[PDB]
Design a binder for this molecule. Sequence first.
Ligand code: MG
Ligand code: MG
Lengths: 52, 324, 141, 34, 41, 109
Amino acid sequence: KNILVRMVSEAGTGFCFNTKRNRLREKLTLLHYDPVVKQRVLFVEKKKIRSL
Amino acid sequence: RRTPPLGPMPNSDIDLSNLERLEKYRSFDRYRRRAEQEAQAPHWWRTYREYFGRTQQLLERKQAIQELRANVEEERAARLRTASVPLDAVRAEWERTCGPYHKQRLAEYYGLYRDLFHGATFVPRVPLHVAYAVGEDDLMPVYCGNEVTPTEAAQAPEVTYEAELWTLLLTSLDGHLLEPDAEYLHWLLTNIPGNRVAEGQVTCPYLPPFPARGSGIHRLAFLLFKQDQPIDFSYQLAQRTFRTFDFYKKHQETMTPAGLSFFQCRWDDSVTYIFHQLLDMREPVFEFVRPPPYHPKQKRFPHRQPLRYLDRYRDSHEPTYGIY
Amino acid sequence: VENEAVAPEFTNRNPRNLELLSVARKERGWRTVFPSREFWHRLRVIRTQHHVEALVEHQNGKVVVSASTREWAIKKHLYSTRNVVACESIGRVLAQRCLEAGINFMVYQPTPWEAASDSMKRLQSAMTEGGVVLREPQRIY
Amino acid sequence: ELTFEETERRALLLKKWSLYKQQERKMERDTIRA
Amino acid sequence: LTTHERVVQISGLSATFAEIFLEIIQSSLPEGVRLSVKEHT
Amino acid sequence: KNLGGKSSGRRQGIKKMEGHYVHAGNIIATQRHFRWHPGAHVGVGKNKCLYALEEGIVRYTKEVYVPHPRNTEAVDLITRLPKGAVLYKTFVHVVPAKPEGTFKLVAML
RNA sequence: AGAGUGUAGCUUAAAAGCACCCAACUUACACUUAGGAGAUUCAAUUGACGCUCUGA
RNA sequence: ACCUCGGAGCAGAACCCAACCUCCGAGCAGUACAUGCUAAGACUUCACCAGUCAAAGCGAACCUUUGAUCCA
Ligand SMILES: [Mg+2]
Ligand SMILES: [Mg+2]
């Protein structure tokens, strides 16, 4: 199945957004737009929110 | 119930049981061509358009084609996709051959005929040329639909045309400030002897373009008329205003249009100079104002509407306090 | 001053007024049909068996500026009227005529294969280097 | 690599083969219809 | 060595049309090829 | 043994018949599949509903149908037609009513 | 001997559009892209050079 | 056995129409991570709740079904 995970900005901002990734898949690192920084930055998976 | 068609239903002529023996649209482009043809064809049903609507010369041409074919260098250039064309020679030849027809198309598209002659058309037989001398070294031409600034059009232009009398007129089809239909003339030379223009009768002196600021783009027309025999004719807008329609009605017996050349003029500081220095009046400034946005009649209870509903209908953004 | 008698509302009758101000409407529908009608002027190229022709047509369908290799003035300067050279020559002639007509901006609507065609690429290069831009400005709302 | 003269000869070869086989198919079709 | 095989399917012949068709095929065979007018199955 | 089938109707169909005055953004017709195709000044949503892109009068017409070449199935369907055949469809247009603005005198500088 | 007469294969096209072909993608066809060839029978609306038909 | 949602017929042509009615399907996946933010005007499952579509604008770029409140 898929799991909802919290991608946290690697830009130091407190910004986080939730994505969906397969449980068997590797931990996620993704470019995403950081509103506070106003620039695309890396986000790293921190913790699993739930299993869906 | 079924009302029968009011005409030949499409795809009815070719409706046959021999579908396998019927040739098909192997390609998309041929279907596109057929579809465009049908769209152009008139129809008995409601359609989008209803609502949104010598021999020696030929022999010489064949011989020239054969000569170009014979030239092997030409074939090598063609197959290496390196050959080119003389743009000036092509322009001159087109002007002589079929340029008048294209210029008539351009005039019709720009609406000169419908606004100058109420739809009565003609053909600019004479390859007229006008150019406003910019500085001293160069002179910006005035083709059919060119774009020339009033700064460059400040002074009267140099006119050239291979012909033999002539009456040349300049009008601004849309510069009028009071009456929508009238128009202003800038300069009118009459009884031109042959080609030389300095000897023309200057009935109305020259004016530069004066399209008001933010009033869009105005189309200025150089008309040239063949003249059989001279006729005596006749900085104030009241006397520069008139209608080319009835003007040329008064002279069509011995005058016939034979040349045209028009251009688009925008605002420019020379327009301010024109409005102040010699027109001696305050220049008008126009702004393109769109209609206010439509909003449905306000309800007492805007059910399910967001909080912005009230802002859609409030006029003053500043807080108000009523009796307090 | 009677010269200062100006109507409160101006009436510019130039058909290209709003189009050049970039305020005129474009037909924004026809999403399910090809080509789009969301333009003011369109460059349409017809490659027949023998002749190559190009048109600059207004949205209402009026043909504004045409350049056909069929015309003597143009066919009298090139070998084959149905090759890349013919396409580029007609493109350059059309670019010159467009500039002299005041049409600086245009929309080209080729099929995928038409775009991939080297002759169409050469025609587009000819137009762009002649000055005409094959991308109309966005409407200002 | 190749040169310009051989390319031109190749193009003329294609042209003359076009003409030759055009005559060929024309005569074949003439026999057909006849 | 190997011999490459090809098949052409045909349907719809007239009286004279069949004659012209196969005589043209007979006369247009380039070099050492094997024709056939066999049927399906 | 037959379950389900209690879904209610979607209340789809034409919302503005021909001649009806339509403001920009009004939904003209909601359809499940393309019964009516967008014409002039008529947009299409994700769910294939037709809405007016301008303020005007709704008109229905029949026009030749030439699909987007990237529409592979439609292109193949066309490829299988005979030479004379031309597909037709019903299109919805909005004939815009007002001009998109007027030039006003603001200041007599 | 007489009649119909006559634009490259077709055109109530006026020197054009369809047709036609090779090259590449195709098993192949097709599509597409590149290229190719082509005619208003001769003299002043008219006579005579060629084709079809009616006879010997 | 069923209880929610959806597709087809009944219900032929705007909408709407039941059943122990005749059939079928679903409780998500794939994708990306602007699949962002805002906002005219509209639709709406016959109420409400809920559910849809969306111009313009800003910002990156150049998507195709399930469930409220409280409570944690
Ligand atoms: Mg049902
Ligand atoms: Mg409701």
